[PDB]
Every structure is written in structure tokens, then in C-alpha cells.
Amino acid sequence: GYDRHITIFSPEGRLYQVEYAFKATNQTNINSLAVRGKDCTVVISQKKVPDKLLDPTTVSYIFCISRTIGMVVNGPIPDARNAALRAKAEAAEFRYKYGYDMPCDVLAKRMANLSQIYTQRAYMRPLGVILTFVSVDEELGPSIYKTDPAGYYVGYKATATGPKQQEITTNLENHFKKSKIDHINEESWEKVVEFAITHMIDALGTEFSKNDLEVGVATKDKFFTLSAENIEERLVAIAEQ
């Protein structure tokens, strides 16, 4: 039974090491969510600091890949940072070679191709992570593209990742069934973040303080993360209506 140890086919045509890498993805017990506005793309993720000895400012699963592209990761931090460093290197090289900023969907494809190689080559293991890339692309507009350990990737109107992804997914599905549009019809990113947090609260059934969340926002020509005090202002507005 060595077909379960390396990435070769089982008699059912399955790759067990890939399947087990998907399971490692939920080891952090963290849920993330991404949505698109008119002018922006918002990504939120749960933040859990279980040890009082930790410096909470260094605990993060959101990464600034380039000026325009942000990435949230679902999975262990070592594999997350491995993927982050590579994505940063790939984005920088792309700009040098081809003279323009690497698009979000193209970076997703590139990282997905790298992941595919780990499923075919025996000496390399898959990374136990799911990567959600976000940006406001200069051609395609607000963009969400998500990669997994199988080497699969696709664009999203909105998406969710983590142990409780299904609850969040169904909640988002129901909203877009009502509105009948592919995005949040809102002018400011502040209100799109408020939408994202509200619908995560509804889906998970839990309340959040300023230290329980982590937020990333993509606008035209920059991606940035919010501070605890920026998130607090967001939480206050949600409670006041």
C-alpha cells in the first residue's frame, strides 16, 4: 500500500496524498470569506490568538503579494509562507519580463500549475493549503481566484474557505439569488467590508470583537490590510443599525 504514501494512482484512479493535503487545510480551524463590490474586492478571515505569550500583531494568514494582489491562506503557516514567498517572487519576475503587473487570475494559474506538478512528481509533496487571490484587475475588474492542493483553480463571484465553508457558501448563495447580480452593489469599500462581516456573523452564528477578525481590501492600484481600530469602526457601524 505505497500508493497512499506518494502521488501515484490508486486502483480507483485516486490520489490519496492530494486528498490528505485537503484535510491538512483545515488544521488551523480558521474560516475565510471573499466578496466583490463595484470598485473593490474584500477578504475577511477569523483571527485566533490562543496563547497570551504571543505577539498578536505577528499572527496573520493574509499576505500582500504585490501592490495590487492580496492572498489569504487556509492551512498551516509554514506551507502558507512557502506559497507566499513563491507568489511574491513570481509576481515580481512577471513584471520584470513582460513590463506590466501580473494579473490576479494569471498568478492563480501559475501557482495552480506548480501545485499540479507536486501531484504528478513523486519527490515533491503537495502543500496543505488553499490560496485565495484577490485584486481589482485593470482589465477584468474586481477578481477572486482560488487555488487548492489538486492544482485546480477558478474565478468566483464570492467564495468561502475553512471548516464551516458550507454554511458561509449557502448564506452567500441565498443573497445572490435575491439580488440577481454578480457583486455587492455598493460604492465604498467600507460598506462592502461591513457586508462581509455581517454575513459571516449570520452564517457562523458568532459575534466578533476587533481582535477576532482580519481584513484585507483590494482597490484600483493597491491592496491593503485593516488595523484593529479600522475594524472596530466597521463593527460599530454594524451594531448601530
Binding site: 520584470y96 519580463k97 513582460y98 513590463g99 506590466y100 494579473p103 487570475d105 494569471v106 494559474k109 485593470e138 482589465e139
Partner: protein, 226 residues
């Protein structure tokens, strides 16, 4: 060789003469110097003709693959970056001097490129042995906010200056117009101001004039059946 590039209202135009030489001898009287890198990115080449042709096709090939990989139409800045890095690596030994022009989702663009790898931006440019004659015309008649018709006129007038005044240039004017939101229109032999006059005499020989030693049928067909 005379090649020019001119920006206008809603796009860019490039033009070139059609003479290729080997020292003082004219090898081809109707040469095609306007090359296609991609459907809406065209370039004209001066210098070593094989190098301009080869470097254009290599980058054009890689641009096509890049376009397929990214699901996006190719950009002029990509062609420029790939061309300059390739040429810099070979330290001028690849003798390609190019004017690169085109339209893409970002807009309309005009650049020039020198064999060592240096690039330039401009509203009007000229390259080749007839570049000084062409640039004289461009510096005399260029203005901001040219129309399509004015730019074609200016570009071909600049090539004509090279044709008539530079011995390295001659014959016809080729033009390619790249306008935003339109197909690029390649105008081969846009002007033909150098048709040879009828000769004074016919030099068709009587049949049997040439002395022959042997005749034989050459078998170009494959080995036959039966």
C-alpha cells in the same frame, strides 16, 4: 532603409521603404520591412535583415504563447521588454534596430529600439540610413492632435524623403495603420512612384540560340509500382 512611426488621434501608424541592399547592389526591389509581432502590434526593422526578421518572430512567437497563457490580448510594453532584454544579452551582436508600434487594452503606443538594448518613446520616430531625411520632414510638419488621414500623409512623405534622398532607400512605400477599437490595416505598396519605363528593345531570343551538349528527363517522382 527608411522607417518611420507617427502617433495620431486614436492610434499609431508605421511606414517603410521597400529596398534591400547588399553593399551598392539592390538585392530585392520590393522588400517587406513591416513585420507582424501580433495582430495589432507591428514593427519595422533596419540593420541586419535576418536579425530583425528573426528577433521579431521569436518575440512574436513568445508573445502569442503569453497571450494564450494569460487569456489577454498582447501588450506593446511586453514586446518592448522582451525585445530589449534579448538584444541587451547579446551586447549588440544581433544587429536589429526596430520601431515598435501597436494598440492594446491600455491604449496606443510607439517605441524604438537599438541593437544594444536601449529603448525610446515618442510621438514621431525614424530609423535606418534614411532616418535623417525622414526626421527632417517629421520635424517640419508634425503637430499635436493629428488625424488618421494626416498621419498617413506625414508618414509616407517622410519615407518619400528617404526614397529620393538616401541611396540606401528606394522603390515603394509600405504602411500599416493601428487604430484603437479596429483591425490593424496593412497597406502593402501604398505608394508606387518608381515603376520602370518600357525598354527600347525586346531581348527574347530565337529558339535554338543556345548550344546544348546533352538532354535528359529528371525523375522527380518516387519509385513506381509494378
Amino acid at each position: 532603409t527608411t522607417i518611420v512611426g507617427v502617433k495620431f488621434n486614436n492610434g499609431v501608424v508605421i511606414a517603410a521603404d521597400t529596398r534591400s541592399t547588399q553593399g551598392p547592389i539592390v538585392a530585392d526591389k520590393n522588400c517587406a520591412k513591416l513585420h507582424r509581432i501580433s495582430p495589432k502590434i507591428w514593427c519595422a526593422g533596419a540593420g541586419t535583415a535576418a536579425d530583425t526578421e528573426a528577433v521579431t518572430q521569436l518575440i512574436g512567437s513568445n508573445i502569442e504563447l503569453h497571450s494564450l497563457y494569460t487569456s489577454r490580448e498582447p501588450r506593446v510594453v511586453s514586446a518592448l521588454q522582451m525585445l530589449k532584454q534579448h538584444l541587451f544579452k547579446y551586447q549588440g551582436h544581433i544587429g536589429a534596430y526596430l520601431i515598435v508600434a501597436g494598440v492594446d487594452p491600455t491604449g496606443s503606443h510607439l517605441f524604438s529600439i537599438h541593437a544594444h538594448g536601449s529603448t525610446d518613446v515618442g510621438y514621431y520616430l525614424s530609423l535606418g540610413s534614411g532616418s535623417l531625411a525622414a526626421m527632417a520632414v517629421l520635424e517640419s510638419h508634425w503637430k499635436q492632435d493629428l488625424t488618421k488621414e494626416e498621419a498617413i500623409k506625414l508618414a509616407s512623405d517622410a519615407i518619400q524623403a528617404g526614397i529620393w534622398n538616401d541611396l540606401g532607400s528606394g522603390s515603394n512605400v509600405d504602411v500599416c495603420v493601428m487604430e484603437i477599437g479596429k483591425d490593424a490595416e496593412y497597406l502593402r505598396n501604398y505608394l508606387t512612384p518608381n515603376v520602370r519605363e518600357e525598354k527600347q528593345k525586346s531581348y527574347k531570343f530565337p529558339r535554338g540560340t543556345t548550344a546544348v551538349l546533352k538532354e535528359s528527363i529528371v525523375n522527380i517522382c518516387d519509385i513506381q509500382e509494378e
